[PDB]
Design a protein around this ligand. Sequence first.
Ligand SMILES: Nc1ncnc2c1ncn2[C@@H]1O[C@H](COP(=O)(O)OS(=O)(=O)O)[C@@H](O)C1O
Ligand SMILES: Nc1ncnc2c1ncn2[C@@H]1O[C@H](COP(=O)(O)OS(=O)(=O)O)[C@@H](O)[C@H]1O
Ligand SMILES: [K+]
Ligand SMILES: [K+]
Lengths: 391, 390
Amino acid sequence: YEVKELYVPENKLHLAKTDAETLPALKINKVDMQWVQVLAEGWATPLNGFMREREYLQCLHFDCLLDGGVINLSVPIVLTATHEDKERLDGCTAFALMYEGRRVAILRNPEFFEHRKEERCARQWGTTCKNHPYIKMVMEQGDWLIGGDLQVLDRVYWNDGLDQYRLTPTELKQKFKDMNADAVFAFQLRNPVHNGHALLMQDTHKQLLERGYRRPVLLLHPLGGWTKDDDVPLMWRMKQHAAVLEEGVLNPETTVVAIFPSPMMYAGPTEVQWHCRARMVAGANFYIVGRDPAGMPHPETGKDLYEPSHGAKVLTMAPGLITLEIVPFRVAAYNKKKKRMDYYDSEHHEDFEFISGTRMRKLAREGQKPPEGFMAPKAWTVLTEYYKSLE
Amino acid sequence: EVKELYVPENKLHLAKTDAETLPALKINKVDMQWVQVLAEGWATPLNGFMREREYLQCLHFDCLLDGGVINLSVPIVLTATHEDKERLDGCTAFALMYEGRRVAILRNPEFFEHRKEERCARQWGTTCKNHPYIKMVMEQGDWLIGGDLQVLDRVYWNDGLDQYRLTPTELKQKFKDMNADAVFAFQLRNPVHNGHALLMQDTHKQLLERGYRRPVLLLHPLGGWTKDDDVPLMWRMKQHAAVLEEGVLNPETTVVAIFPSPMMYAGPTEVQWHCRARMVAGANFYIVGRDPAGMPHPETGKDLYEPSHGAKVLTMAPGLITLEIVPFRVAAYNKKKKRMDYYDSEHHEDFEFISGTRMRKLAREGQKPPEGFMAPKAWTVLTEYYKSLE
Ligand SMILES: Nc1ncnc2c1ncn2[C@@H]1O[C@H](COP(=O)(O)OS(=O)(=O)O)[C@@H](O)C1O
Ligand SMILES: Nc1ncnc2c1ncn2[C@@H]1O[C@H](COP(=O)(O)OS(=O)(=O)O)[C@@H](O)[C@H]1O
Ligand SMILES: [K+]
Ligand SMILES: [K+]
């Protein structure tokens, strides 16, 4: 499938920047800007811009875009707006999007429709807790939505020393061709890589070898847009990942590291389909999913928001993901008896230690290194440096 | 191809005897209405109450996906308590009991978490309190039981309306016998006024212009659980019969039947269920207007659902491949024309919305609605209904 970038072609860029100057403008924040990037680069192919009411309904009710062939798209990609914004811009055939004083895109032939936040949130997240970090933001947004045809002007760069890893779906496909990959397997992550993740990646690599693939390539694809405030920063995670690769826990010769530009929504089984379909767009043939993907603890009752087995189950059954195979895994934990990461077994409960991100910080605070084989020692060292800086 | 879950009539004695030998689970009236839905084949190709994978599929995608795509947008599930689960977990089969009577065998059971709050948020698109169906869900247990269902004796309600309770198979057989060349279906839960009739008449005429010679109307009122302030089924049936009596709808080209499903008031999610059920009964066209399956927010009074969403979602919904959706704009009483007409804003002051409360008010006042809003005899049935309220 062809990736539909929404960037104005190089030759036509100046003429478009000229037109953008004369139009009215809407100011957008960093998160909207990240959604603009997701759209420009083609991650939400075949959308031509921010969702009109028709696509919005399709993704909310069916988790698929239906016009052009069934293709999975389970999250709204929408632009919000106040009644003030609406009354100002309603009745014009185009306006410019503005971020940090710069006119970043043109939205053409806009349509205004009701946000209906309660329904959107209930269907997207399975809850309307306004203490959910992303939902909190949605609830602070306007009651109107704007759809339309999006024309993105200047290519998006963040100028933070990580732009070299922000490869488009097209750049990623070119990369895999250059490497002579005969199978690409993808691992989405928002956390530091431990050897449970590596176990999933290594076992997927072995499964691909056993099927007859000779040059399977890992796409290690950390998420790089908005995350909740207690998540490990992207720069610190990038450093931690490099340490894992340097230690050879993952092989740097058969691995591609890129940053996935999407905001994190913590919407569990609905979001896992979004993470999946975006890797499909980038040329992934296999997608790894473990326990409780895209999940978080309910804010209040510290219980899992989503049932931990559901992400894999739902993704396994999901339509509009035909060209990519799901590789599901059960929980991996540290096996004390074998002194390595292993798949959890209830018949041997007390063999296993579970170490969460909260447990990791506390361990560091207490001058501890995690057990041998839980994490590459060098990568742990990077983590201890992150925890120390939190002071 | 309907998959009835009733046991064949010559296998029935064996099945009732087998059912006697089993542990039992008592079910309520609404549960019983869902057993009837399943038994009659309205949820084809379901084998019984949903297992976890089907439940996940319909919550997340509005479709069954195993070896084909068929629309199914509502959980058809059997709830259980922790005590019920404790007792029945490990049974290869058990009976369902309603009013001391064994009505069904559930075989090869599987228990999975209900996750009520998540279920409700995805199904109703709301976490609002005081929804009438959601309120019954919240009172139920945290476990669900799926499995293969064999229903026993034909379900009768013995209320004087069982002759309207046709299975999809009987409806198809009926259409054949009337030489129908097209069946258009109309779902309803309210009294029929002449705006409803306008939708039906214009579908009839559009079907004639399209080439069909014997189009049949399936007037198909919903007959299972409904909220407290809705008009009782027996009264709605008398009111519809008056409408046909007056020939606002032609009794010769119309089949009246009662759809057994509980009413969930879930808007766009529920309209798909209403639509797919008529597809099973051989409907080729399905009429939908504004706010189908909708209701006001108990608190704010604002529409729970955006009124145009039902028709929009339905027209683009998957798994309804042999049925044509016939979407309509708002019909309302036109004063300048003295008749029911399609709502238009340039002439907005010519229109009046005549609701259930406008009608109850005119009833306690000896006033009729304007001429052309309803058939005179049908209005009379309603005045008798309102009389009986106090
Ligand atoms: N005034 C109207 N204009 C257009 N369609 C209408 C109007 N009133 C009701 N309808 C509709 O008639 C059908 C049955 O409506 P109701 O019996 O009120 O409630 S429903 O729950 O079954 O949808 C629906 O398709 C529908 O939206
Ligand atoms: N201990 C584990 N066992 C099995 N799978 C795991 C484990 N920890 C994380 N996963 C998973 O690893 C992948 C990335 O997890 P995270 O980065 O923590 O969160 S996620 O938001 O990207 O899903 C997911 O597929 C996933 O469910
Ligand atoms: K607003
Ligand atoms: K319980």
